[PDB]
Design a protein around this ligand. Structure first.
Ligand SMILES: [Cl-]
Ligand SMILES: [Cl-]
Ligand SMILES: [Cl-]
Ligand SMILES: [K+]
Ligand SMILES: [Mg+2]
Ligand SMILES: [Mg+2]
Ligand SMILES: [Mg+2]
Ligand SMILES: [Mg+2]
Ligand SMILES: [Mg+2]
Ligand SMILES: [Mg+2]
Ligand SMILES: [Mg+2]
Ligand SMILES: [Mg+2]
Ligand SMILES: [Mg+2]
Ligand SMILES: [Mg+2]
Ligand SMILES: [Mg+2]
Ligand SMILES: [Mg+2]
Ligand SMILES: [Mg+2]
Ligand SMILES: [Mg+2]
Ligand SMILES: [Mg+2]
Ligand SMILES: [Mg+2]
Ligand SMILES: [Mg+2]
Ligand SMILES: [Mg+2]
Ligand code: NA
Ligand code: NA
Ligand code: NA
Ligand code: NA
Ligand code: NA
Ligand code: NA
Ligand code: NA
Ligand code: NA
Ligand code: NA
Ligand code: NA
Ligand code: NA
Ligand code: NA
Ligand SMILES: [Sr+2]
Ligand SMILES: [Sr+2]
Ligand SMILES: [Sr+2]
Ligand SMILES: [Sr+2]
Ligand SMILES: [Sr+2]
Ligand SMILES: [Sr+2]
Ligand SMILES: [Sr+2]
Ligand SMILES: [Sr+2]
Ligand SMILES: [Sr+2]
Lengths: 194, 46, 119, 237
RNA sequence: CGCACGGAGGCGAAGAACCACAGAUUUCCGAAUGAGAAUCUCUAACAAUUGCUUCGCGCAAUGAGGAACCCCGAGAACUGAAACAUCUCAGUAUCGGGAGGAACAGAAAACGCAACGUGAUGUCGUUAGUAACCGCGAGUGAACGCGAUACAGCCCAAAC
RNA sequence: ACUCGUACGGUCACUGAAUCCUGCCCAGUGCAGGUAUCUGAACACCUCGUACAAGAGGACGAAGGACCUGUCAACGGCGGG
RNA sequence: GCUUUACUGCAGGCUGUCGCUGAGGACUCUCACUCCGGGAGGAGGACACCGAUAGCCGGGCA
């Protein structure tokens, strides 16, 4: 039958209706007063967490990040940068907020590696994401048959090289066919036209 | 000006590098110190 | 808190937890929010326990309404780890279920009643 | 062109900042839980660099030493009181309500508890007019009717040092010295005496702004100079 | 008994020189980490940030370097268009972050020679200056397929 | 930043000690204020259109503008017959 | 380099609208949110702030 999990999930399908609506209105007040990276004992969205790879083990950390909202905060132009080149309040950046989050998080934890992240709400001027990080040095995880992969030296700073799932989903790598000619196998490998 | 202990050791070394190529090297090599620094004409770091 | 709609008197809770310990040592019980859930869905639940000190509240939010559309009676427990120890576990639990009591059916019966009276 | 002087200002560089390190105190209303059992005695009457007005040094019943904005009158040896029950004499401080209508007050709080905001200049003074269980209308030195929460504390009497504005500086030197102790750049070069590249009014083969001086409120910094959103100009008419 | 053929002297048949490997020693500054400092000084140090935790720095991690390569971000102008704004130069130069001996990609919500067809991924040859774009100007410009290289497929979440 | 500041303040401009004075002009331009009426984008909204969408018309209508007033120690003007 | 009622744009100010945003064409409210207060608590209040968009102005700038 339905798993208790499928309930948490089925609820966040519309974080603005019912109990969850009352929760967020409350939590946020507390959230809005927390740092920019708060570690938390348990994931707010359990289904999602586990689903994304979470495990109630040793070395599996969760942290809620809070990034300022908006689009782009771009200066005008020092020298003589023409019209098509005067970006300031009408353009946005090529990296989505969740990626910014994942990064700030991994920095706060200079030894942990990003596993994944999820949204947990957003008031009128900031977005919150919980990021699942992992200690590649705790044997507790070095042994785990489902997570020991995140230990390869070539997984170091995996988030800063866009290896997160959201990382890849942003580098235009979702589709295996049409419209991904300039993305895969690498944006840089494609003279950045993706 | 006041010189520190290091600033001194250095100035010391620098003064020493200012010696001539010992007579014997001339012979042992059958034939010039390209680093002769004069207190007036040249200039040391710091 | 958001899933709680009535406070269960210190005394009443005690009884509930007391009954639970003999429930494991007689009939049967489910330990864990997930196990508790299915039981309510399968109907094989007579009395379900839900901790009040849970966070994220997500985990349990559903219980109160799912048990109401399944008749199954339920009771709140101020603290999480007590329910865990009351179900005989090293690490506290957020929700437990009394799957067919045992030499407690008399109590359960009343407790379930005592709460109905508690609105 | 280049940024104009007004734009350089904002940057907050030395030249533009005020010699704060040479300033005495942030004159604010002492605090009392409530009641009124607070009153010290005037120990000194000093000169505050930041305002060119006099400021009294008061010592309280508890042994607290703090400078207070000196209203005309307050001499040394005198005792002033602070609180809701504080006697209604020149120098003492108490919420607007407790103050009898038609009485000149200075150093008036905008938000009850801020510590004084209005009327603090030399010889200036506010006037308490209307009283209510809600609002306490006060006429400020500019002649404006400022409705205030009766809980806003104020001091009784005009700010000492009045009339300073009545004697002409006579010479730049004097002006120079005053300025040297204020967050102000000096002297003042006229916009029209500058190069086009330096100011909206610069350039030309003779001084004269090449535009009407009254500028739109919406003007952007760098362009907003001369008569800002003037509702009119000239003396007559 | 270095470059480096001198003087004096010394070492080597106790097998030196010399070479390969492994080891010892390895001052101070230096990521530089007890604190400060133009390589020195002052009175026990994983400083700072983290994970685990006997909650004790007890056990661990990070930091910085490297010719270029690689990956993720930020992102010009000269110039071309015989001027010039879109366009071009060009996602080039330059900057910020990060990994490895290779990186990235990768086992289809694919393809669509529409089929009774193919069957992860890079890459090379071609497809092709084709389709497509574009003050439809100057210019820009793929893919499926094919021939090759190499080939290798798997693990969770949930149900129980 | 101004600001340990508060209209006897400080900001932005002009003229340039004292003394005697500082005329007329608000049409244009600027600034400011008002405004029946008119004009005035997008969203939501009505009608039609499309099994949806592109779309057609309507409706309401902000600042702004029209329009009206104030202002020249505001840009400036002070002729011909 | 500089100017402007040259061309084209951008900051920026003004304004409508959408989100933040809640309870009962004019209104009440308090609970988010903002400000004052050491605090208790006070003021303000779904406005303001901020994200987005739309119209006007826009040599301050390119
Ligand atoms: Cl990472
Ligand atoms: Cl002055
Ligand atoms: Cl095929
Ligand atoms: K160009
Ligand atoms: Mg010598
Ligand atoms: Mg003060
Ligand atoms: Mg003056
Ligand atoms: Mg000065
Ligand atoms: Mg001048
Ligand atoms: Mg000049
Ligand atoms: Mg100019
Ligand atoms: Mg002149
Ligand atoms: Mg003049
Ligand atoms: Mg050190
Ligand atoms: Mg050209
Ligand atoms: Mg490649
Ligand atoms: Mg042409
Ligand atoms: Mg191109
Ligand atoms: Mg294709
Ligand atoms: Mg002159
Ligand atoms: Mg504050
Ligand atoms: Mg220009
Ligand atoms: Na890290
Ligand atoms: Na693209
Ligand atoms: Na010298
Ligand atoms: Na060595
Ligand atoms: Na270390
Ligand atoms: Na420790
Ligand atoms: Na040309
Ligand atoms: Na040219
Ligand atoms: Na073009
Ligand atoms: Na006129
Ligand atoms: Na004239
Ligand atoms: Na020039
Ligand atoms: Sr690293
Ligand atoms: Sr010399
Ligand atoms: Sr626990
Ligand atoms: Sr204060
Ligand atoms: Sr103050
Ligand atoms: Sr001029
Ligand atoms: Sr006149
Ligand atoms: Sr294959
Ligand atoms: Sr006029």
């Amino acid at each position: 039958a339905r798993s208790a999990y499928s309930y948490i999930r089925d609820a966040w399908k519309n974080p603005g209706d019912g109990q969850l609506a009352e929760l967020q209105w409350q939590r946020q007040q507390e959230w809005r007063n927390e740092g920019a990276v708060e570690r938390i004992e348990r994931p707010t969205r359990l289904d999602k967490a586990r689903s994304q790879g979470y495990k109630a083990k040793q070395g599996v950390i969760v942290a809620r990040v809070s990034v300022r909202k908006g689009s782009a905060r771009k200066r005008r132009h020092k020298a003589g940068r023409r019209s098509k080149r005067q970006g300031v309040t009408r353009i946005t950046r090529r990296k989505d907020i969740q990626r910014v989050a994942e990064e700030r998080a991994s920095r706060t934890f200079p030894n942990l590696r990003v596993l994944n992240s999820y949204s947990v709400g957003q008031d009128g001027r900031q977005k919150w994401h919980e990021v699942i990080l992992i200690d590649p040095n705790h044997p507790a995880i070095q042994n785990d048959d489902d997570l020991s992969w995140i230990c390869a030296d070539d997984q170091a700073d995996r988030v800063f090289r866009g290896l997160t799932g959201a990382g890849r989903r942003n580098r235009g790598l979702s589709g295996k066919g049409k419209g991904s000619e300039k993305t895969r196998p690498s944006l840089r490998s494609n003279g950045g036209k993706g | 000006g006041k010189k520190s202990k290091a600033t001194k050791k250095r100035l010391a070394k620098l003064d020493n590098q200012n010696s001539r190529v010992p007579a014997w090297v001339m012979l042992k090599t059958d034939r010039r110190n390209h680093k002769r620094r004069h207190w007036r004409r040249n200039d040391t770091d710091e | 808190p958001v899933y709680v709609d009535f406070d269960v008197p210190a005394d009443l809770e005690d009884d509930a937890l007391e009954a639970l310990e003999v429930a494991r040592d007689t009939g049967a019980v489910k330990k864990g929010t997930n196990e508790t859930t299915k039981s309510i869905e399968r109907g094989s639940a007579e009395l379900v326990f839900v901790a009040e000190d849970v966070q994220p509240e997500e985990i349990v939010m559903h219980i109160p309404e799912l048990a109401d559309e399944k008749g199954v009676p339920f009771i709140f427990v101020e603290q999480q780890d007590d329910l865990g120890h009351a179900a005989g576990l090293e690490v506290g639990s957020a929700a437990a279920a009394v799957t067919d009591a045992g030499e407690a059916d008399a109590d359960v019966e009343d407790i379930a009643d005592k709460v109905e009276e508690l609105r | 062109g280049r940024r104009i002087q007004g734009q350089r200002r904002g940057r907050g560089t030395s030249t533009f900042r005020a010699p704060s390190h040479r300033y005495k105190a942030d004159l604010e209303h002492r605090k009392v839980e409530d009641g009124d059992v607070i009153a010290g005695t005037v120990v000194d009457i000093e000169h505050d660099p930041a305002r060119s007005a006099p400021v009294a040094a008061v010592e309280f019943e508890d042994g607290d030493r703090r400078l207070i904005l000196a209203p005309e009158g307050v001499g040394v040896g005198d005792e002033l009181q602070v609180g809701v029950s504080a006697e209604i004499a020149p120098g003492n401080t108490l919420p607007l309500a407790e103050i009898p209508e038609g009485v000149p007050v200075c150093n008036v709080e905008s938000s009850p508890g801020d510590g004084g905001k209005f009327a603090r200049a030399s010889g200036v003074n506010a006037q308490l007019l209307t009283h209510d269980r809600n609002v306490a209308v006060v006429k400020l030195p500019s002649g404006e009717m400022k409705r205030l929460d009766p809980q806003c504390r104020a001091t009784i009497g005009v700010v000492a040092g009045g009339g300073r504005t009545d004697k002409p500086f006579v010479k730049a030197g004097n002006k120079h010295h005053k300025m040297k102790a204020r967050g102000t750049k000096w002297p003042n070069v006229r916009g029209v005496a500058m190069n086009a590249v330096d100011h909206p009014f610069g350039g030309g083969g003779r001084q004269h702004p090449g535009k009407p001086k009254s500028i739109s409120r919406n003007a952007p910094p760098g362009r907003k100079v001369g008569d800002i959103a003037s509702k009119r100009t000239g003396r007559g008419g």
